[PDB]
Every structure is written in C-alpha cells, then in structure tokens.
Symmetry: C3
Subunit: 144 residues, 3 copies
C-alpha cells in the first residue's frame, strides 16, 4: 500500500487546514511517528536579552476545527539549554481564529541572550478536543 | 428555534456547575463561538511589581466532571502587552475540587508594574477530558 | 467487590506502562479520586537560586499510548508558596518516548532559593488524547 491510503486505525484522524503566509518556510511537521505536536518555525530573526519577550511570527495560519483547540507549547530542548519559554504557555488557538500564529517568546535566562533565526523551530502546535461547556449557575453544589 | 433548544450537534456537550462566591462579577463567558475557554475575572485589585506574584481570587468555584480536568491558561494579550503570566500554567483544576479558583499571576516584565483591577479578565478556563490512567509497572518496556 | 475488578464505568480507562529507573521512589500516584495527574518525584537534591533552572530526574520512564500525550504540569502549591515553575510547561511527553522523564524546574522568585529534596513531589503527569492531525495546505481558507 502507498501513502494516499488512510490506514484503518487512522480512518478517524482529523485534518487541519493551514495557510503558509510565509511560503519560504517548510510546513510544520511531526519529528516522529505519534509525536503530539508539529514544530512551528520562526519567520524572523530576533534577539532576546535576558528577561525580554517578543511576539514572533510563525508564517502560518490554521483553522482549528469547531470542538477543538490548538495549543502552542515550548520546545523542551531550548527550554533547558537556553531558558527559552513562552509567556502565555500554553498558547490557546481558538477554532474561530484565522490570523497568523504568533509565539510570545521570552528569555528566562539571567545573563545570556537568545538568538533566534528565521527557519529555527521555536514551538510546537498540538490539536485537542475541548469541551465547550455550558455553565450551570447554582447557589451551592448540593443544589446541583 | 429559540435558545433553550439544544441544537443537534451540541446534544452531547457537557455542563459545568459553577458558584459565584462573588456575585458582583459577571459569569465567565466565551468571547466568541467555538472559543476554547471562558474568561475568568479578578475579584480584586492587585499590583504586581516586576518579578512578583500573587494568588488572585476569581470569585468562582466549579465542579469539573469526573473524567475531566479544568485548565487555567494565561490570556495572550496581557502576556504580550505587559508580561503577565501564570506561575503554575496550565493551572490544573481537579474534578474533586470545590474551592474558589485562584490564579497565581506573576509579572515577567523587567521594569513595569502590572495593575489588575477588580472586574478585569485575567485568565481563561478550559475543560477537557483526561485519561485517569491505571499505572502498570514493568521491569522493561519489552516486557509489556 | 474487591480491587482487582474493573468497575463498569472504568471499563474503558487506559493503562500506562511505567518503569521505575529509580526503584527507591514510590510510584507516581493520584492524591485523590478523579485527580487529573499523578505526582512525579524528584530523584535528586537540587538547589535553585533565584532565576536559575535545572533539569531534574524523576526516576521514571513511561510509554504513553499512541494517540495520546503525557503532559507535565507544575504543582500549584509550590508555584504560589515559593515561585517554583517549569520552563517548558506544559512539558510534552510523546507516545514514542521511552527515556527518563526529566523536569525543567526554574525558580521564579526574586530573592529566595528553592531547595528540592530527593523524594519531594515536584510536578504532575497527565495523560490525554491528542489529534494526530493531517495538515491540508490551502491557498486561502475560502478554498477549503
Ligand atoms: O518536560 C519534558 C518534556 C519532554 N521530555 C522528553 C519527552 C519528549 O517526547 C521528548 C522531546 O520533548 P520536546 O518535543 O518537548 N523537546 P524538543 O523539541 O527540544 O526535542 P525533540 O527534538 O526530541 O522533540 O523529551 C521530558 O522528559 N520532559
Ligand atoms: O500563542 C498564541 C495564542 C493565541 N493566538 C491567537 C489565537 C487565539 O484564538 C487568539 C486569542 O488568544 P487568547 O484568547 O489566548 N488572548 P486574549 O484573550 O488576550 O485575546 P482575545 O480577546 O482575542 O481572545 O490569539 C496566537 O497567535 N498565539
Ligand atoms: O491554577 C489553579 C490550580 C489549582 N487550583 C486548585 C484546584 C486544584 O484541584 C487544587 C490542587 O491543585 P494542584 O494539584 O495544581 N497543586 P498541589 O499539588 O500543590 O496541591 P494538592 O496537594 O491540593 O493537589 O488547587 C486553583 O484554584 N487554581
Ligand atoms: Mg519536539
Ligand atoms: Mg481570549
Ligand atoms: Mg496536586
């Protein structure tokens, strides 16, 4: 069997429409089979002094399906090696959002600046279902 | 059709009981259709110097259903604009928890204090299913 | 009925194989019924000055099932009390990963060092399903 056939056990897996606003970057991909996230690239060069943060363009936009959420998580390697984090982690991408995904990077190292270059992988994007809960206000939890 | 009718495609959507311990705040709501989270308010005024953190009352309590988790995520706007983050993000709200949701806000800006006023939206609350996994200890992964 | 019988409503609950690389630590457990996470221990003593971070061994390895993700979240108590956080939170554990779970702890307090002792609970591990999305590149979202 070739690629185009959806294997049985992946019949149900979901699709995510994506637009490369920056066509010069590779499409986000999973580094390994079963990996939770696809790796987002930086569209830009940016240098972050200790304690500084930046809102960095990834060059993509996505259409998260209704009933789901996209989540932007930090890469573990850079987090440890150089103290790179994401201010609003986990970044919450709503089903209705059709703008460019931007990553609020922050340098949590005390002394060493972090240089990010265009084309570097700077975060990962997961997609999960979410319960769009209906609030039921009660006067006490007994009542419910 | 009017509001009270549960549309077909939302027959299965879950309910979340909530108690406004602070009845003076609006109920948390989704800013847009399909948004992953409902926006939590601060019950209080608080001022956070750079690097400082506070445990801020939201004026609500919830009953996350068994088999699910509530998750407190930072708002992207404040995160970028002013460096506001959440120390324990993502905040983990257990199914059994019936206390007030409190938000561990922290100012990650190097120089500018953040002022939060009562009634400001300071986080978002998502609800997701969680696998309540049964651990199976093995001596090596082959064995399993 | 005794323990070994899987109750009806937990017929479907998933298993997580785990190896204690450090057999001297307790197995991670849920502190209460319905808790989202199991509590990870530190295998080691470590002292974190303000602003410093460390990659701390938990003494376990796990096999997250294909179609799921493990997620390492900070404990709320330590986060508030002493400013302890996790640089890459939420830590993303892929289905394929068979190495030791390590926690990138960071001291976000301005002045007081944090001492972690072997055997202390330093994070929690959740397991959730994840959508292993198939990207569909489009030239505009209309097109899709
Ligand atoms: O908190 C964590 C996160 C990850 N890990 C392990 C499990 C995970 O599958 C593996 C890779 O993690 P990330 O994808 O978060 N980091 P990065 O993208 O830098 O490394 P890789 O190229 O291996 O994916 O590291 C941990 O032990 N603790
Ligand atoms: O890391 C992120 C997070 C969000 N976003 C986009 C997608 C999301 O749907 C939109 C709104 O995000 P938040 O709800 O996290 N922030 P805030 O509540 O300040 O803005 P809004 O009023 O638009 O919801 O911003 C990103 O590009 N990157
Ligand atoms: O952001 C949060 C996180 C938790 N909480 C409440 C709900 C949760 O079920 C309870 C315990 O949270 P954690 O497990 O995250 N922290 P810790 O492990 O220190 O406390 P406990 O021993 O109670 O689990 O604290 C909040 O109000 N806000
Ligand atoms: Mg990775
Ligand atoms: Mg929002
Ligand atoms: Mg706990």
């Amino acid at each position: 069997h070739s690629s185009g056939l959806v294997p049985r056990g992946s019949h149900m897996s979901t699709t995510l429409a994506i637009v490369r606003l920056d066509p010069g970057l590779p499409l986000p991909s999973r580094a390994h089979d079963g990996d939770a996230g696809v790796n987002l690239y930086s569209a830009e060069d940016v240098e972050l002094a200790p304690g500084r943060r930046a809102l960095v363009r990834t060059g993509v936009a996505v259409a998260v399906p209704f009933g789901m959420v996209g989540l932007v998580h930090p890469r573990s390697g850079l987090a440890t090696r150089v103290g790179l984090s994401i201010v609003n982690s986990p970044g919450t991408i709503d089903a209705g959002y059709r703008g460019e995904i931007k990553v609020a990077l922050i340098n949590l190292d005390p002394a060493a600046p972090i240089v990010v270059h265009r084309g570097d992988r700077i975060a990962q994007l997961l997609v999960q279902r979410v319960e769009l809960v209906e609030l039921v206000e009660v006067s006490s939890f007994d009542e419910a």
